[PDB]
Design an enzyme around this catalytic site. Structure first.
Site, PDB file in Angstrom:
ATOM      1  N   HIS A  68       0.818  -1.227   0.000  1.00  0.00           N
ATOM      2  CA  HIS A  68       0.000   0.000   0.000  1.00  0.00           C
ATOM      3  C   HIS A  68       0.845   1.267   0.000  1.00  0.00           C
ATOM      4  O   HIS A  68       0.692   2.127   0.862  1.00  0.00           O
ATOM      5  CB  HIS A  68      -0.980  -0.098   1.117  1.00  0.00           C
ATOM      6  CG  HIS A  68      -2.043  -1.129   0.891  1.00  0.00           C
ATOM      7  ND1 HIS A  68      -2.031  -2.333   1.529  1.00  0.00           N
ATOM      8  CD2 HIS A  68      -3.236  -1.040   0.257  1.00  0.00           C
ATOM      9  CE1 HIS A  68      -3.169  -2.958   1.268  1.00  0.00           C
ATOM     10  NE2 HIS A  68      -3.929  -2.187   0.500  1.00  0.00           N
ATOM     11  N   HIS A  72       1.415   1.600  -5.734  1.00  0.00           N
ATOM     12  CA  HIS A  72       0.021   1.126  -5.813  1.00  0.00           C
ATOM     13  C   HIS A  72      -0.900   2.276  -6.221  1.00  0.00           C
ATOM     14  O   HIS A  72      -1.739   2.076  -7.065  1.00  0.00           O
ATOM     15  CB  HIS A  72      -0.389   0.465  -4.511  1.00  0.00           C
ATOM     16  CG  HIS A  72      -1.839   0.196  -4.398  1.00  0.00           C
ATOM     17  ND1 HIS A  72      -2.425  -0.865  -5.016  1.00  0.00           N
ATOM     18  CD2 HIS A  72      -2.793   0.746  -3.625  1.00  0.00           C
ATOM     19  CE1 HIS A  72      -3.696  -0.944  -4.655  1.00  0.00           C
ATOM     20  NE2 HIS A  72      -3.943   0.036  -3.807  1.00  0.00           N
ATOM     21  N   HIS A 106      -6.385   7.183  -2.859  1.00  0.00           N
ATOM     22  CA  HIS A 106      -7.356   6.229  -2.233  1.00  0.00           C
ATOM     23  C   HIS A 106      -6.745   5.496  -1.029  1.00  0.00           C
ATOM     24  O   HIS A 106      -7.523   4.930  -0.186  1.00  0.00           O
ATOM     25  CB  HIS A 106      -7.993   5.279  -3.260  1.00  0.00           C
ATOM     26  CG  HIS A 106      -7.108   4.124  -3.560  1.00  0.00           C
ATOM     27  ND1 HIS A 106      -5.968   4.253  -4.300  1.00  0.00           N
ATOM     28  CD2 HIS A 106      -7.216   2.823  -3.228  1.00  0.00           C
ATOM     29  CE1 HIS A 106      -5.377   3.069  -4.360  1.00  0.00           C
ATOM     30  NE2 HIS A 106      -6.115   2.177  -3.690  1.00  0.00           N
ATOM     31  N   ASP A 107      -5.430   5.447  -0.908  1.00  0.00           N
ATOM     32  CA  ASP A 107      -4.805   4.683   0.211  1.00  0.00           C
ATOM     33  C   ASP A 107      -3.833   5.595   0.997  1.00  0.00           C
ATOM     34  O   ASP A 107      -2.948   5.061   1.672  1.00  0.00           O
ATOM     35  CB  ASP A 107      -4.088   3.427  -0.301  1.00  0.00           C
ATOM     36  CG  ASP A 107      -4.936   2.160  -0.372  1.00  0.00           C
ATOM     37  OD1 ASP A 107      -5.819   1.958   0.464  1.00  0.00           O
ATOM     38  OD2 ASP A 107      -4.680   1.344  -1.270  1.00  0.00           O
ATOM     39  N   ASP A 217      -8.526  -1.024  -8.020  1.00  0.00           N
ATOM     40  CA  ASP A 217      -7.819  -1.369  -6.795  1.00  0.00           C
ATOM     41  C   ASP A 217      -7.325  -2.791  -6.889  1.00  0.00           C
ATOM     42  O   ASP A 217      -6.222  -3.047  -6.408  1.00  0.00           O
ATOM     43  CB  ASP A 217      -8.749  -1.164  -5.619  1.00  0.00           C
ATOM     44  CG  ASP A 217      -8.001  -1.113  -4.328  1.00  0.00           C
ATOM     45  OD1 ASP A 217      -6.754  -0.894  -4.379  1.00  0.00           O
ATOM     46  OD2 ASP A 217      -8.663  -1.274  -3.315  1.00  0.00           O
ATOM     47  N   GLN A 269      -5.249 -17.924  -3.665  1.00  0.00           N
ATOM     48  CA  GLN A 269      -5.353 -17.043  -4.856  1.00  0.00           C
ATOM     49  C   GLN A 269      -6.607 -17.474  -5.620  1.00  0.00           C
ATOM     50  O   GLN A 269      -7.431 -16.561  -5.918  1.00  0.00           O
ATOM     51  CB  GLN A 269      -4.017 -16.996  -5.624  1.00  0.00           C
ATOM     52  CG  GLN A 269      -2.944 -16.136  -4.944  1.00  0.00           C
ATOM     53  CD  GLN A 269      -3.366 -14.688  -4.851  1.00  0.00           C
ATOM     54  OE1 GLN A 269      -3.696 -14.028  -5.835  1.00  0.00           O
ATOM     55  NE2 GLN A 269      -3.493 -14.203  -3.635  1.00  0.00           N
TER      56      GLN A 269
HETATM   57  C1  LIG Z   1      -7.762  -6.664  -1.820  1.00  0.00           C
HETATM   58  C2  LIG Z   1      -7.129  -7.945  -1.309  1.00  0.00           C
HETATM   59  C3  LIG Z   1      -6.315  -8.544  -2.379  1.00  0.00           C
HETATM   60  N1  LIG Z   1      -6.008  -7.946  -3.622  1.00  0.00           N
HETATM   61  C4  LIG Z   1      -5.247  -8.651  -4.540  1.00  0.00           C
HETATM   62  C5  LIG Z   1      -4.750  -9.957  -4.360  1.00  0.00           C
HETATM   63  C6  LIG Z   1      -3.888 -10.659  -5.419  1.00  0.00           C
HETATM   64  C7  LIG Z   1      -5.057 -10.580  -3.095  1.00  0.00           C
HETATM   65  N2  LIG Z   1      -4.714 -11.832  -2.582  1.00  0.00           N
HETATM   66  C8  LIG Z   1      -5.321 -11.862  -1.372  1.00  0.00           C
HETATM   67  C9  LIG Z   1      -5.297 -12.996  -0.361  1.00  0.00           C
HETATM   68  C10 LIG Z   1      -6.205 -14.055  -0.859  1.00  0.00           C
HETATM   69  C11 LIG Z   1      -6.094 -15.201   0.039  1.00  0.00           C
HETATM   70  N3  LIG Z   1      -4.980 -15.811   0.377  1.00  0.00           N
HETATM   71  C12 LIG Z   1      -5.328 -16.807   1.234  1.00  0.00           C
HETATM   72  N4  LIG Z   1      -4.472 -17.704   1.848  1.00  0.00           N
HETATM   73  C13 LIG Z   1      -3.076 -17.794   1.704  1.00  0.00           C
HETATM   74  C14 LIG Z   1      -2.646 -19.122   2.249  1.00  0.00           C
HETATM   75  C15 LIG Z   1      -3.794 -19.517   3.113  1.00  0.00           C
HETATM   76  C16 LIG Z   1      -4.903 -18.554   2.878  1.00  0.00           C
HETATM   77  N5  LIG Z   1      -6.597 -16.845   1.403  1.00  0.00           N
HETATM   78  N6  LIG Z   1      -7.101 -15.810   0.622  1.00  0.00           N
HETATM   79  C17 LIG Z   1      -8.466 -15.420   0.446  1.00  0.00           C
HETATM   80  N7  LIG Z   1      -5.988 -10.693  -1.172  1.00  0.00           N
HETATM   81  N8  LIG Z   1      -5.790  -9.885  -2.198  1.00  0.00           N
HETATM   82 MG   LIG Z   2      -7.332   0.767   0.710  1.00  0.00          MG
HETATM   83 ZN   LIG Z   3      -5.739   0.248  -2.720  1.00  0.00          ZN
END
Ligand SMILES: CCc1ncc(C)c2nc(CCc3nc(N4CCCC4)nn3C)nn12
Ligand SMILES: [Mg+2]
Ligand SMILES: [Zn+2]
Length: 313
Positions: A68, A72, A106-107, A217, A269
């Site tokens: 962030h 970004h 935004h951040d 975002d 992912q």
């Molecule tokens: C806005 C949040 C966001 N923007 C972009 C991207 C690529 C992104 N990736 C993730 C994490 C997603 C995730 N990772 C896991 N893991 C990892 C190993 C066990 C659990 N569970 N979850 C749901 N948030 N995120």
């Molecule tokens: Mg934010």
């Molecule tokens: Zn953001």
């Protein structure tokens, strides 16, 4: 007045595409942003001296956290720019002015922690802003910077145009709270399908600008695979630090934030592309056909995460 910003040929061409990466040269990011405002909004939207001084104050108020950060901010604004350029005639003069600024801001002053961790730590921002805690903070930091001597880039708008633009930016920034996104997309889903979606209804625009904000975002999922994969390392570098901090408060973090679940990143992912990314760009493409390259790129990167799980890379 007669002073255009240009970019080198490869950037001049690639900046028009959804999947453009702003590159590792920090010092070019301001010019990239000014270039995008000038083409999106016209060379007369902002006094250049004010715009430059506003960009540099915004930069100074982003922190050196792994995800962030200032990179970004400029990434999320380039995606907004791509959306705006491909849907030329759907947006007002004020909307084009406001949304690029909203995305840069935004951040603002993000610390690398979720609204959740601020609430469990009992950070003062969590008692000033009980929901969308960081997003209400980002908006507040925007207004602060706009009130600095010499930084009111909107100083030529009417009293009431100024209020409209700050209201577009506030709703735009609040919509980046991914807790609000699920309900926002569900409602847009229903209105598009039942044919009730109406872009003259201001509350419908709001929803549609909110989905654009979420799409911009999340736009790391719409890049060439090597960009997508290396951005995920930054995203988890923060999440796992938060997990560390949760363990320091006596709290088991969720798996997303537990560095002991490195092994499961690929499957996390998939969840995220299936639960969040794909539905976002699907609904966005239905409402704004010319954004389909974001959906198509996202589907490409889901398939790359599938390949990682299968030992194929
Ligand atoms: C806005 C949040 C966001 N923007 C972009 C991207 C690529 C992104 N990736 C993730 C994490 C997603 C995730 N990772 C896991 N893991 C990892 C190993 C066990 C659990 N569970 N979850 C749901 N948030 N995120
Ligand atoms: Mg934010
Ligand atoms: Zn953001």
């Amino acid at each position: 007045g007669l002073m255009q910003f240009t970019l080198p040929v490869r950037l001049c061409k690639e900046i028009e595409l959804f999947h453009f990466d702003i590159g590792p040269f920090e010092n070019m990011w301001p010019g990239i942003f000014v270039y995008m405002v000038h083409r999106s909004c016209g060379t007369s939207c902002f006094e250049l001296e004010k715009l430059c001084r506003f960009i540099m104050s915004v930069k100074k108020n982003y922190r050196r956290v792994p995800y962030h950060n200032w990179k970004h901010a400029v990434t999320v604004a380039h995606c907004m720019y791509a959306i705006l350029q491909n849907n030329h005639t759907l947006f007002t003069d004020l909307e084009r002015k406001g949304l690029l600024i909203a995305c840069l801001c935004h951040d603002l002053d993000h610390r690398g922690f979720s609204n959740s961790y601020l609430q469990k730590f009992d950070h003062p921002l969590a008692a000033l802003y009980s929901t969308s805690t960081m997003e209400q903070h980002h908006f507040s930091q925007t207004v602060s910077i706009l009130q600095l001597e010499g930084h009111n880039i909107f100083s030529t708008l009417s009293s009431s145009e100024y209020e409209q633009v700050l209201e577009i930016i506030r709703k735009a920034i609040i919509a980046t709270d991914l807790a609000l996104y699920f309900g926002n997309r569900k409602q847009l889903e229903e209105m598009y399908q039942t044919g009730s979606l109406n872009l003259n209804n201001q509350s419908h625009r709001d929803r549609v600008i909110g989905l654009m904000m979420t799409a911009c975002d999340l736009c790391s999922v719409t890049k060439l695979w090597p960009v997508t994969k290396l951005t995920a390392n930054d995203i988890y570098a923060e999440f796992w630090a938060e997990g560390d901090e949760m363990k320091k408060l006596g709290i088991q973090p969720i798996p997303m934030m537990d560095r002991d679940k490195k092994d499961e990143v690929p499957q996390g992912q998939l969840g995220f592309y299936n639960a969040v990314a794909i539905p976002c760009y699907t609904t966005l493409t239905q409402i704004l056909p010319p954004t389909e390259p974001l959906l198509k790129a996202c589907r490409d990167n889901l398939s790359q995460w599938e390949k990682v799980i299968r030992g194929e890379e």
